């Protein structure tokens, strides 16, 4: 009585794979710090050039994305996290993503910090959390995050 685990959108760190995907023409999504989230693409055909679109949704029959030529910078790619547009989605904006260290209350009334190794969902759309060293899956309300 549940739904299988949902993969998180893996950020891409290596520039080489980013450029290879771009050369293949696969769409990229760039999280700019100052001015929001944008799509990046390589122009099809012989006249190769980079294009940008702010039509920030999955392509649909009723919603076709418009692409403007832009001189995307290498430094922009390096300093800003980039995701494959096939993955990054509204489907699961989980409060505690995978590999995040979170604080959870154990049965012995002793707060411990563990890293989330697996996350899944159920019929109600809840976020079941798996923590290393324990089998029982916790809930959203029980957990807590520690920052800095």
């Amino acid at each position: 009585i549940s739904l299988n685990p949902i993969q998180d959108a893996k950020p891409i760190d290596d520039i080489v794979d980013i450029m290879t995907y771009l050369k293949n023409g696969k769409v990229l999504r760039v999280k700019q710090d100052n001015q929001g989230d944008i799509l990046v693409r390589m122009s099809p055909g012989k006249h190769k050039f980079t294009e940008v679109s702010r039509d920030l949704d999955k392509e649909s029959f009723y919603y076709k994305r418009h692409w403007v030529l832009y001189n995307v910078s290498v430094n922009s790619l390096i300093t800003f996290d980039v995701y494959l547009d096939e993955e990054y989605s509204e489907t699961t904006k989980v409060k505690y993503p995978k590999d995040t260290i979170v604080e959870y209350t154990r049965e012995d009334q002793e707060k411990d910090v563990a890293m989330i190794k697996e996350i899944l969902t159920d019929n109600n759309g809840n976020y079941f959390y798996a923590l290393i060293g324990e089998t029982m899956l916790f809930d959203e309300n029980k957990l807590n995050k520690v920052k800095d």
Partner: protein, 259 residues
């Protein structure tokens, strides 16, 4: 002597449209393309203000399909070609009047079958040459040669619609008049302007001015607390449709039913 497919007689109900071509014929054939809508909006581009996207052709087709649909009721018509399977009741007064029948949908391009049945078995199927049609009005009448009412006695099969016009400035009664093309276009534009009028400036902003370091920019739009941004054009389109629509009902005329 004469040569013809048995259902179709050149006299009375000459063949006009092949049954198979009914599927092929579409909106593009009648000139209802998105480009037509754009042409009437020559110099205007419908574009999102916050991103460079223009609205696609699919939306235009969706609107156009509803424009032609609205017209099909507004004048009681069947406009695109389609095949109809129609059952009708027996009324003695019309039956004695050469078996007069008023089809529910008009015009009638052609008639394939006209039979009388009792319990699904055809009691009598008339010769093809006997029956004759009035295409525009859709009257079906029979001219035989050498209680007072009952339900669903007869069975009628016919094709309702209009063919695309073959030659300029002219149309046969069985042929799409040019006005329906423009009328459906104007209905579509009423929707498109309703969308576009919100994208003139901002959202519901009538008057504006920026003054920066002695620079000054100032705009006052058509938008107002009691009038919409495109409502000037919408009003003019109503004045246009009223002239067009009334003048076209005179071509089809008023409906009548005996009682």
């Amino acid at each position: 002597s004469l040569n013809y497919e048995y259902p179709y007689h050149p006299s009375g109900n000459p063949k006009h449209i092949d049954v198979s071509e009914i599927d092929n014929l579409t909106l593009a054939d009648y000139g209802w393309s998105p480009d037509a809508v754009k042409a009437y909006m020559f110099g205007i581009v419908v574009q999102n203000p916050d991103t460079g996207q223009p609205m696609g052709d699919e939306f235009y087709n969706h609107i156009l399909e509803r424009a032609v649909g609205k017209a099909e009721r507004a004048l009681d018509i069947s406009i695109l070609p389609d095949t109809q399977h129609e059952m009708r009741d027996y009324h003695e007064t019309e039956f004695n009047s050469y078996m007069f029948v008023h089809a529910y949908r008009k015009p009638i391009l052609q008639v394939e079958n006209l039979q009388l049945q009792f319990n699904g078995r055809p009691i009598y199927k008339y010769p093809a040459n006997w029956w004759k049609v009035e295409h525009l009005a859709g009257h079906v009448q029979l001219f035989p040669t050498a209680a007072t009412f009952a339900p669903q006695m007869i069975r009628l099969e016919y094709v309702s619609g209009m063919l695309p016009r073959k030659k300029a400035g002219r149309n046969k009664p069985w042929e799409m008049p040019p006005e329906l093309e423009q009328l459906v276009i104007k209905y579509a534009l009423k929707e498109i302007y309703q969308v576009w009028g919100n994208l003139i400036i901002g959202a519901g902003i009538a008057n504006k001015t920026l003054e920066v370091d002695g620079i000054t920019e100032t705009i006052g739009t058509t938008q107002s607390a009691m009038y919409g941004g495109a409502s000037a054009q919408i009003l003019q389109i109503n004045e246009d449709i009223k002239e067009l629509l009334d003048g076209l009902r005179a071509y089809f005329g008023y409906n009548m039913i005996g009682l």
